[PDB]
PDB file of C-alpha atoms in Angstrom:
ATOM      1  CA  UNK A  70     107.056  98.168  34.884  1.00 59.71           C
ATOM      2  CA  UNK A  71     104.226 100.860  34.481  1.00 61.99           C
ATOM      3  CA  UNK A  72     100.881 100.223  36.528  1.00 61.71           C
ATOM      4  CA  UNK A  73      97.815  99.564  33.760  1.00 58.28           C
ATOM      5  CA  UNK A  74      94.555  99.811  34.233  1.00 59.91           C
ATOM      6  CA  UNK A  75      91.152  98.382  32.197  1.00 58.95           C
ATOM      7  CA  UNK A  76      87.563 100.337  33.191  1.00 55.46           C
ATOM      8  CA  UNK A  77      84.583  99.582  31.655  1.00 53.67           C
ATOM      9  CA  UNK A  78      83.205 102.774  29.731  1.00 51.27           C
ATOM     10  CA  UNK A  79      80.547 102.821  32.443  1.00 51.30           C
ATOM     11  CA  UNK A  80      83.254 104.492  34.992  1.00 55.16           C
ATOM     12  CA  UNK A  81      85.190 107.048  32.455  1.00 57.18           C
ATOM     13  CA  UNK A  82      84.311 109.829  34.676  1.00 53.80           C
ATOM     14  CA  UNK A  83      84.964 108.407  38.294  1.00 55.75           C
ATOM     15  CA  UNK A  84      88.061 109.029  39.758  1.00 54.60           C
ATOM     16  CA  UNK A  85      89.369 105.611  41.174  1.00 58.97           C
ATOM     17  CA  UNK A  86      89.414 107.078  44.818  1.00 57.96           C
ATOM     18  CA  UNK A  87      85.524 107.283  44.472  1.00 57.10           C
ATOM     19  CA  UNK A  88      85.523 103.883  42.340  1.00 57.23           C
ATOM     20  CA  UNK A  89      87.337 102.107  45.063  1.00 61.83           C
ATOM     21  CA  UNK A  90      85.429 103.543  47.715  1.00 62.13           C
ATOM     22  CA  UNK A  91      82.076 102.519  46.416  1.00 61.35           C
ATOM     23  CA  UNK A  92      83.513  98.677  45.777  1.00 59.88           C
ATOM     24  CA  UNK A  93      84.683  98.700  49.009  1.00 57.77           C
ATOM     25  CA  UNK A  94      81.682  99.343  50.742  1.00 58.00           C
ATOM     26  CA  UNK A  95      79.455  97.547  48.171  1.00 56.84           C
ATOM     27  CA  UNK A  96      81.105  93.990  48.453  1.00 60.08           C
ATOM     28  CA  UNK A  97      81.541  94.915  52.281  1.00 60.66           C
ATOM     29  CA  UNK A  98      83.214  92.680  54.798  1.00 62.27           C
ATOM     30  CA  UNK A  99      82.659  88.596  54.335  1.00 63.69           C
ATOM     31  CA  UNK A 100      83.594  88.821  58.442  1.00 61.40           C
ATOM     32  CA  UNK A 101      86.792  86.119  57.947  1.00 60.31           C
ATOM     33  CA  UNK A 102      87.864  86.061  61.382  1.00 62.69           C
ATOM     34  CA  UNK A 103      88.200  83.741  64.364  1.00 62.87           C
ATOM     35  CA  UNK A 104      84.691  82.145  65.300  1.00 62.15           C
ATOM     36  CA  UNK A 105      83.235  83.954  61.662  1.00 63.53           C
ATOM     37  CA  UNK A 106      84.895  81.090  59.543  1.00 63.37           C
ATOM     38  CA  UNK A 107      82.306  79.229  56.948  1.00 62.60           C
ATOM     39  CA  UNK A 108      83.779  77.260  54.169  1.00 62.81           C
ATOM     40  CA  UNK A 109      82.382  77.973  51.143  1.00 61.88           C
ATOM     41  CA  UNK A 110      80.735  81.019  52.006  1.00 63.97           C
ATOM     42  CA  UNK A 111      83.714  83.325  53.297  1.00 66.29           C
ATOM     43  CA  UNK A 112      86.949  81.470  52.835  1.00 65.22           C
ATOM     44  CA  UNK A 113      87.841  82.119  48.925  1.00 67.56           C
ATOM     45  CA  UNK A 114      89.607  79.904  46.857  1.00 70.40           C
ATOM     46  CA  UNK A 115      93.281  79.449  44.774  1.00 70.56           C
ATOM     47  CA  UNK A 116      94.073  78.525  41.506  1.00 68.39           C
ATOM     48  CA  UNK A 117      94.829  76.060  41.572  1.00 71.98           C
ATOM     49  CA  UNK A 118      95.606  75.582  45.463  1.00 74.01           C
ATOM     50  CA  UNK A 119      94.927  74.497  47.809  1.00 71.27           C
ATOM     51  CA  UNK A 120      96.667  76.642  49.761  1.00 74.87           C
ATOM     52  CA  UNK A 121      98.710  79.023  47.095  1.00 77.11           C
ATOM     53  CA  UNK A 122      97.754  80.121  43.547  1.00 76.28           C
ATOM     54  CA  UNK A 123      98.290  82.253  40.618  1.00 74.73           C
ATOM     55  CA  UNK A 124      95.195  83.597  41.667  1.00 73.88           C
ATOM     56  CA  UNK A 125      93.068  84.130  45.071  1.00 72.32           C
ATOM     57  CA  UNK A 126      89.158  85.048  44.310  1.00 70.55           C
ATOM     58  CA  UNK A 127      86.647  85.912  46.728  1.00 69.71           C
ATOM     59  CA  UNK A 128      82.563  86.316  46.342  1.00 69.32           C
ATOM     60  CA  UNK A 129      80.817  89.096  48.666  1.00 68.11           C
ATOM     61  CA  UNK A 130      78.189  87.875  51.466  1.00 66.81           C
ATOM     62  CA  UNK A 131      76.319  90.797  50.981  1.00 68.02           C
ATOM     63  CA  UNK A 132      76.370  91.568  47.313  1.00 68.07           C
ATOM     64  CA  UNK A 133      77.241  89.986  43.354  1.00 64.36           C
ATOM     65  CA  UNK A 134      80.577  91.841  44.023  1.00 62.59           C
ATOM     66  CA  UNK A 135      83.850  89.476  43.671  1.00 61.68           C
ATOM     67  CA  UNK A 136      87.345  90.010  43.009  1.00 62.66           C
ATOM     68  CA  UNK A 137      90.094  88.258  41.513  1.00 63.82           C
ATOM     69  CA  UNK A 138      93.836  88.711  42.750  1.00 66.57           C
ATOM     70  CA  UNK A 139      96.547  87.636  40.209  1.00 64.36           C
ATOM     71  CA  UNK A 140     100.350  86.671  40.814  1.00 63.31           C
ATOM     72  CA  UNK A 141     102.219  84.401  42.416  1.00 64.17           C
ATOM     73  CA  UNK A 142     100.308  83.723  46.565  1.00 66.64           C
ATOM     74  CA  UNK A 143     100.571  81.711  48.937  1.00 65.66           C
ATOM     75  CA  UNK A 144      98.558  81.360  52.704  1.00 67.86           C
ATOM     76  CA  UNK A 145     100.563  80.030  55.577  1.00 68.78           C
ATOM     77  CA  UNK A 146      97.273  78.977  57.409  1.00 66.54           C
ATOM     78  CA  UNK A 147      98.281  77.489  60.948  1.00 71.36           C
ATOM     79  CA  UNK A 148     101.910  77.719  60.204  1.00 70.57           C
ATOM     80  CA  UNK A 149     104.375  80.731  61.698  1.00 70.55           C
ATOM     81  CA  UNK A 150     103.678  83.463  61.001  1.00 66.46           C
ATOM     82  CA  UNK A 151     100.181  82.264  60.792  1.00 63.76           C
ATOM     83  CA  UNK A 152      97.118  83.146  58.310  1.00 63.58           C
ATOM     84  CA  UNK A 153      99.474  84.893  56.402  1.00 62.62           C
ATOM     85  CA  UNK A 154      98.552  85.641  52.417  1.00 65.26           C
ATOM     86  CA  UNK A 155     102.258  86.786  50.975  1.00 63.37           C
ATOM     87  CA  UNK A 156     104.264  86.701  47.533  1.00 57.53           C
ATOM     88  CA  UNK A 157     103.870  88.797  44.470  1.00 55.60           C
ATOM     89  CA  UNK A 158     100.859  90.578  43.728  1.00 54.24           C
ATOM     90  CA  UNK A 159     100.488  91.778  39.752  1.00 48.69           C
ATOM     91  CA  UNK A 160      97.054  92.382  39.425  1.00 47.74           C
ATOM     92  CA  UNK A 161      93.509  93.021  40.934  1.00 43.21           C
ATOM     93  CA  UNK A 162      90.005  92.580  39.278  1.00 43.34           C
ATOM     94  CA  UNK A 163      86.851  93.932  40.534  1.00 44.47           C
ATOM     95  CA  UNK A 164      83.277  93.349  38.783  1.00 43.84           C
ATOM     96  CA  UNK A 165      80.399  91.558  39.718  1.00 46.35           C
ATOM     97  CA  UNK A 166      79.776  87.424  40.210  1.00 44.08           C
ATOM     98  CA  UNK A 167      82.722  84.985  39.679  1.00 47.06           C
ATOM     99  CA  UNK A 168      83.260  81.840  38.072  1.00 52.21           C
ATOM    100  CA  UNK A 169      85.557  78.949  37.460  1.00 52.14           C
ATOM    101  CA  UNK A 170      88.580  78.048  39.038  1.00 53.58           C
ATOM    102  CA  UNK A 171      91.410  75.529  37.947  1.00 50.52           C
ATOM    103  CA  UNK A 172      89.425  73.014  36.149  1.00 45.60           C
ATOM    104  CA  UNK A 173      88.075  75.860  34.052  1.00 48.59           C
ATOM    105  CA  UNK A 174      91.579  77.468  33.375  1.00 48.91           C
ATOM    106  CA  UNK A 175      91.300  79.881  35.830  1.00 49.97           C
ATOM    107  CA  UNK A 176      88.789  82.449  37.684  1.00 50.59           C
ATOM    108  CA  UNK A 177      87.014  85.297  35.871  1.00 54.83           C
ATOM    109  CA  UNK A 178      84.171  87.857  36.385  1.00 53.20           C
ATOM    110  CA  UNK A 179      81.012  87.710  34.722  1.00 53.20           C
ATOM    111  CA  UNK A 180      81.107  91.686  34.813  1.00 55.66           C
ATOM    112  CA  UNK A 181      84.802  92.621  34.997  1.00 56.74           C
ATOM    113  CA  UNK A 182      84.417  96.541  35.858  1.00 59.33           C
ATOM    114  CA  UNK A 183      87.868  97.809  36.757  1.00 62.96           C
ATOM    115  CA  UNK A 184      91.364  96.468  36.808  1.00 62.03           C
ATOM    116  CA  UNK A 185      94.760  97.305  37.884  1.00 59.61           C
ATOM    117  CA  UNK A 186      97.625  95.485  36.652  1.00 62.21           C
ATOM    118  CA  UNK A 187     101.834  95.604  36.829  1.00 60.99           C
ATOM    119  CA  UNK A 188     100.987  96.209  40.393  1.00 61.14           C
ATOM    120  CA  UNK A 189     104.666  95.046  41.279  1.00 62.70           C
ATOM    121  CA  UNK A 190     104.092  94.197  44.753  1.00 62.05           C
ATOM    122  CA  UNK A 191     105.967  91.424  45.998  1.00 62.77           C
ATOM    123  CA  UNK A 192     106.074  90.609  50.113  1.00 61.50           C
ATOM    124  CA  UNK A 193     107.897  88.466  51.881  1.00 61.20           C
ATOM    125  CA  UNK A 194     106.983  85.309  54.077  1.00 61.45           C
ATOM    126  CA  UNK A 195     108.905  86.936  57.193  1.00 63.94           C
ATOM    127  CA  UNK A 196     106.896  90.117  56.793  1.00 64.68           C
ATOM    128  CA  UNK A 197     103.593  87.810  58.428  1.00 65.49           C
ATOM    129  CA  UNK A 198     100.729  89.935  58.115  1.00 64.36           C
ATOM    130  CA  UNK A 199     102.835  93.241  58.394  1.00 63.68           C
ATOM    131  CA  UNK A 200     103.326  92.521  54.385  1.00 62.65           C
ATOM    132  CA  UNK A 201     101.946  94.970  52.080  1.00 63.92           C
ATOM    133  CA  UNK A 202     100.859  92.153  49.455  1.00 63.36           C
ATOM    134  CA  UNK A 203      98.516  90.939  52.516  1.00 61.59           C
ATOM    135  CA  UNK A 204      97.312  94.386  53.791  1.00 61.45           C
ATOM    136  CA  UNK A 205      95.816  94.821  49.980  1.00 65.48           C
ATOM    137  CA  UNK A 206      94.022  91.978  49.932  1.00 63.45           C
ATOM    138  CA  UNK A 207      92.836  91.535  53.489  1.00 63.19           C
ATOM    139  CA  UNK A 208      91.721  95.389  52.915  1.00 65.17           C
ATOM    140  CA  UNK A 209      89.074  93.240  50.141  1.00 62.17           C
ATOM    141  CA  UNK A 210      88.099  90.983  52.146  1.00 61.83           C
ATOM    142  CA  UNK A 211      86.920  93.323  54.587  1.00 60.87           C
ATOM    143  CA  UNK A 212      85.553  96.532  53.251  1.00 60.18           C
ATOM    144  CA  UNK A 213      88.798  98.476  53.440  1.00 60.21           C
ATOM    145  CA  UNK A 214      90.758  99.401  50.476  1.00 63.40           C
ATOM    146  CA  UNK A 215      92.775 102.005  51.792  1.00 63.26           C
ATOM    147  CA  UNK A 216      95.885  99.882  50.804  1.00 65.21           C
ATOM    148  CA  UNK A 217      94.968  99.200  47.306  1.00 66.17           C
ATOM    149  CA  UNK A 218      94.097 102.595  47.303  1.00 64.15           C
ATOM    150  CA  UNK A 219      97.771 103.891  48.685  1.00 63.58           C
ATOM    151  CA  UNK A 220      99.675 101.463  46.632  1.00 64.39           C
ATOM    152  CA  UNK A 221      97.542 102.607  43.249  1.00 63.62           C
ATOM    153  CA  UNK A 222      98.317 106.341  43.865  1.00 64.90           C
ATOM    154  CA  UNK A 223     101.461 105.573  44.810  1.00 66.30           C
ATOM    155  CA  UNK A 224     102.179 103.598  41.060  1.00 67.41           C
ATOM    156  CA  UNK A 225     100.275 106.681  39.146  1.00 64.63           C
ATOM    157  CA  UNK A 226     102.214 109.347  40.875  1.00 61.01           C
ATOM    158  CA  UNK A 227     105.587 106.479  39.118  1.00 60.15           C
ATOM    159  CA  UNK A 228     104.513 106.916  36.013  1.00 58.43           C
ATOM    160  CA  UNK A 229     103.776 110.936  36.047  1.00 59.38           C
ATOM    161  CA  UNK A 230     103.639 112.989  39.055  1.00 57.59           C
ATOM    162  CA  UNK A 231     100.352 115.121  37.567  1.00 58.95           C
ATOM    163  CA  UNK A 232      98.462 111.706  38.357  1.00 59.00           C
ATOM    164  CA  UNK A 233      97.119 110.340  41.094  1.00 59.03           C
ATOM    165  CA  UNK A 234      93.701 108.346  42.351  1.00 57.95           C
ATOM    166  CA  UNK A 235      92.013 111.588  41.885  1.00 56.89           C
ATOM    167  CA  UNK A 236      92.266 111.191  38.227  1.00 58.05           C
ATOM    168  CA  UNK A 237      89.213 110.004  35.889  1.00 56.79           C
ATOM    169  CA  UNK A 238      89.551 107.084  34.548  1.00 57.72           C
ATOM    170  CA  UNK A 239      89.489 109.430  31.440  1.00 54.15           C
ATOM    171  CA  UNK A 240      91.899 111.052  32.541  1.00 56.43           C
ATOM    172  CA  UNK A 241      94.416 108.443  33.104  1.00 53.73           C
ATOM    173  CA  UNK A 242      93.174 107.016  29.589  1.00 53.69           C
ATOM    174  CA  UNK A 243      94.403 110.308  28.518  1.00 53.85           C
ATOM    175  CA  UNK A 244      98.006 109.658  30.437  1.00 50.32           C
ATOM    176  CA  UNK A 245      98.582 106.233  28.199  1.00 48.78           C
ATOM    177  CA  UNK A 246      97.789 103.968  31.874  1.00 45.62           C
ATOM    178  CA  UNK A 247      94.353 103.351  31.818  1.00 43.10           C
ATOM    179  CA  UNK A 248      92.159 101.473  28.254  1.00 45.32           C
ATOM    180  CA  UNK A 249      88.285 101.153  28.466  1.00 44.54           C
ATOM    181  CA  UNK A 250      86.919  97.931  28.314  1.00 44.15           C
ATOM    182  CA  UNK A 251      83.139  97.131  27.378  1.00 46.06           C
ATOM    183  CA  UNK A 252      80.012  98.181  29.136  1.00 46.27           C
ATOM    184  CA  UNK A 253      78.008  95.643  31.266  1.00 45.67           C
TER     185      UNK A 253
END
Protein backbone atom coordinates (compact mmCIF):
# COMPACT_ATOMS: atom_id res chain seq x y z
CA UNK A 1 0.00 0.00 0.00
CA UNK A 2 3.24 2.18 0.38
CA UNK A 3 3.90 4.87 -2.48
CA UNK A 4 7.38 3.73 -4.50
CA UNK A 5 9.34 5.59 -6.40
CA UNK A 6 12.25 4.78 -9.33
CA UNK A 7 14.82 8.01 -10.19
CA UNK A 8 17.43 7.73 -12.41
CA UNK A 9 20.87 8.37 -10.54
CA UNK A 10 20.95 11.60 -12.53
CA UNK A 11 18.27 13.21 -9.91
CA UNK A 12 19.65 11.67 -6.38
CA UNK A 13 20.00 15.08 -5.09
CA UNK A 14 16.72 16.90 -6.29
CA UNK A 15 14.02 17.01 -4.09
CA UNK A 16 10.84 15.90 -6.11
CA UNK A 17 9.15 19.39 -5.45
CA UNK A 18 12.02 20.87 -7.66
CA UNK A 19 11.93 17.60 -9.99
CA UNK A 20 8.29 18.07 -10.61
CA UNK A 21 8.49 21.61 -11.06
CA UNK A 22 11.08 21.54 -13.75
CA UNK A 23 8.93 18.60 -15.73
CA UNK A 24 6.15 20.60 -15.44
CA UNK A 25 7.31 23.51 -17.04
CA UNK A 26 9.64 21.62 -19.46
CA UNK A 27 6.88 19.43 -21.21
CA UNK A 28 4.59 22.63 -20.76
CA UNK A 29 0.98 22.78 -21.80
CA UNK A 30 -0.07 20.71 -25.23
CA UNK A 31 -3.16 23.57 -25.04
CA UNK A 32 -6.09 20.54 -25.07
CA UNK A 33 -8.97 22.70 -24.93
CA UNK A 34 -12.02 23.73 -26.93
CA UNK A 35 -10.96 25.18 -30.46
CA UNK A 36 -6.97 23.87 -29.47
CA UNK A 37 -7.94 20.16 -30.35
CA UNK A 38 -5.39 18.37 -33.04
CA UNK A 39 -5.45 14.67 -33.26
CA UNK A 40 -2.34 13.28 -33.15
CA UNK A 41 -0.52 16.10 -31.95
CA UNK A 42 -2.32 16.93 -28.50
CA UNK A 43 -4.94 14.32 -27.86
CA UNK A 44 -2.81 11.25 -26.26
CA UNK A 45 -3.61 7.85 -26.59
CA UNK A 46 -4.92 4.47 -24.37
CA UNK A 47 -3.79 1.18 -24.14
CA UNK A 48 -5.36 -0.27 -25.58
CA UNK A 49 -8.50 2.16 -26.00
CA UNK A 50 -9.98 3.73 -27.59
CA UNK A 51 -11.45 5.52 -25.12
CA UNK A 52 -10.13 3.75 -21.65
CA UNK A 53 -6.82 1.95 -20.90
CA UNK A 54 -4.46 0.50 -18.52
CA UNK A 55 -2.51 3.26 -19.55
CA UNK A 56 -3.01 7.03 -20.93
CA UNK A 57 0.42 8.55 -22.54
CA UNK A 58 0.93 11.88 -23.77
CA UNK A 59 4.03 13.51 -25.94
CA UNK A 60 4.89 17.37 -25.20
CA UNK A 61 4.37 20.05 -28.16
CA UNK A 62 7.12 21.87 -27.00
CA UNK A 63 9.71 19.40 -25.86
CA UNK A 64 10.94 15.23 -26.00
CA UNK A 65 9.10 15.22 -22.59
CA UNK A 66 6.18 12.43 -22.33
CA UNK A 67 4.51 10.69 -19.66
CA UNK A 68 2.90 7.54 -19.10
CA UNK A 69 -0.15 7.12 -16.59
CA UNK A 70 -0.80 3.50 -15.39
CA UNK A 71 -4.09 1.89 -13.86
CA UNK A 72 -7.27 1.24 -14.67
CA UNK A 73 -8.89 4.91 -16.95
CA UNK A 74 -11.39 5.66 -18.67
CA UNK A 75 -12.56 9.24 -20.72
CA UNK A 76 -16.23 9.96 -20.90
CA UNK A 77 -15.65 12.26 -24.01
CA UNK A 78 -19.15 13.83 -25.02
CA UNK A 79 -20.98 11.83 -22.49
CA UNK A 80 -22.28 13.38 -18.84
CA UNK A 81 -20.24 14.45 -17.07
CA UNK A 82 -18.31 15.20 -20.13
CA UNK A 83 -14.37 15.01 -21.01
CA UNK A 84 -14.00 13.39 -17.93
CA UNK A 85 -10.59 11.07 -17.38
CA UNK A 86 -11.65 8.94 -13.99
CA UNK A 87 -10.86 5.41 -12.34
CA UNK A 88 -7.81 4.22 -10.54
CA UNK A 89 -4.61 5.79 -10.93
CA UNK A 90 -1.38 3.46 -9.68
CA UNK A 91 1.34 4.96 -11.30
CA UNK A 92 3.00 7.93 -13.22
CA UNK A 93 6.16 7.93 -15.51
CA UNK A 94 8.02 10.88 -16.59
CA UNK A 95 11.23 10.77 -19.02
CA UNK A 96 11.79 11.85 -22.32
CA UNK A 97 10.17 10.52 -25.96
CA UNK A 98 7.54 7.69 -25.94
CA UNK A 99 6.87 4.72 -27.81
CA UNK A 100 4.53 1.89 -28.53
CA UNK A 101 1.17 1.38 -27.57
CA UNK A 102 -1.06 -1.86 -27.61
CA UNK A 103 0.32 -3.61 -30.53
CA UNK A 104 3.71 -3.28 -28.88
CA UNK A 105 2.49 -4.52 -25.37
CA UNK A 106 2.15 -1.35 -24.02
CA UNK A 107 3.72 2.37 -23.86
CA UNK A 108 7.22 3.09 -22.51
CA UNK A 109 9.84 5.92 -22.37
CA UNK A 110 12.90 5.91 -24.21
CA UNK A 111 14.44 7.85 -21.10
CA UNK A 112 12.28 6.87 -18.11
CA UNK A 113 13.64 9.57 -15.44
CA UNK A 114 11.33 9.41 -12.45
CA UNK A 115 8.43 7.32 -11.32
CA UNK A 116 5.87 7.11 -8.71
CA UNK A 117 3.99 4.07 -8.17
CA UNK A 118 1.16 2.48 -5.49
CA UNK A 119 -0.26 5.87 -6.04
CA UNK A 120 -3.73 4.43 -4.78
CA UNK A 121 -5.87 6.94 -6.27
CA UNK A 122 -9.05 5.77 -7.42
CA UNK A 123 -12.03 8.49 -8.55
CA UNK A 124 -15.23 8.05 -9.32
CA UNK A 125 -17.32 8.61 -12.63
CA UNK A 126 -19.86 10.97 -10.61
CA UNK A 127 -16.95 13.04 -9.35
CA UNK A 128 -16.76 14.59 -13.41
CA UNK A 129 -13.79 16.59 -13.50
CA UNK A 130 -13.97 17.49 -9.68
CA UNK A 131 -12.09 13.86 -9.38
CA UNK A 132 -8.71 13.85 -8.02
CA UNK A 133 -7.53 10.94 -10.51
CA UNK A 134 -8.41 13.70 -13.33
CA UNK A 135 -6.97 16.85 -11.59
CA UNK A 136 -3.42 14.76 -11.65
CA UNK A 137 -3.40 14.12 -14.95
CA UNK A 138 -5.02 17.15 -16.53
CA UNK A 139 -2.32 19.03 -14.16
CA UNK A 140 0.26 16.99 -17.08
CA UNK A 141 -1.29 17.86 -19.71
CA UNK A 142 -1.06 21.36 -18.97
CA UNK A 143 2.02 22.45 -17.16
CA UNK A 144 0.57 22.15 -13.67
CA UNK A 145 1.52 19.48 -11.33
CA UNK A 146 0.45 20.89 -8.25
CA UNK A 147 -1.87 17.79 -7.82
CA UNK A 148 0.64 15.17 -8.43
CA UNK A 149 2.63 17.16 -6.35
CA UNK A 150 -0.11 17.29 -3.26
CA UNK A 151 -1.10 13.74 -3.67
CA UNK A 152 2.90 12.59 -3.64
CA UNK A 153 3.57 14.52 -0.36
CA UNK A 154 0.58 13.55 0.86
CA UNK A 155 1.63 9.42 0.31
CA UNK A 156 5.37 10.23 1.77
CA UNK A 157 4.12 12.02 4.79
CA UNK A 158 1.80 7.86 4.91
CA UNK A 159 4.63 6.14 5.02
CA UNK A 160 6.77 8.41 7.66
CA UNK A 161 5.84 11.76 8.74
CA UNK A 162 9.83 13.03 8.55
CA UNK A 163 9.16 12.80 4.63
CA UNK A 164 7.76 14.82 2.36
CA UNK A 165 8.39 16.28 -1.47
CA UNK A 166 11.15 18.19 0.05
CA UNK A 167 13.11 15.09 0.40
CA UNK A 168 16.08 14.02 -2.08
CA UNK A 169 15.48 11.44 -3.94
CA UNK A 170 18.44 10.21 -1.74
CA UNK A 171 16.84 10.81 0.86
CA UNK A 172 13.74 8.92 0.33
CA UNK A 173 16.16 6.06 -1.06
CA UNK A 174 17.40 6.30 2.40
CA UNK A 175 13.55 5.93 3.86
CA UNK A 176 13.14 2.33 1.89
CA UNK A 177 10.42 4.40 -0.86
CA UNK A 178 12.46 5.52 -3.46
CA UNK A 179 15.35 2.81 -5.78
CA UNK A 180 17.63 4.46 -8.46
CA UNK A 181 17.28 3.38 -11.77
CA UNK A 182 20.03 3.88 -14.61
CA UNK A 183 21.43 7.06 -15.98
CA UNK A 184 20.36 8.33 -19.48
Amino acid sequence: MSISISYSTTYSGWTVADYLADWSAYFGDVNHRPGQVVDGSNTGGFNPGPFDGSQYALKSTASDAAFIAGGDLHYTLFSNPSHTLWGKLDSIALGDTLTGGASSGGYALDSQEVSFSNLGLDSPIAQGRDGTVHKVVYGLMSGDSSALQGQIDALLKAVDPSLSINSTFDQLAAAGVAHATPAA
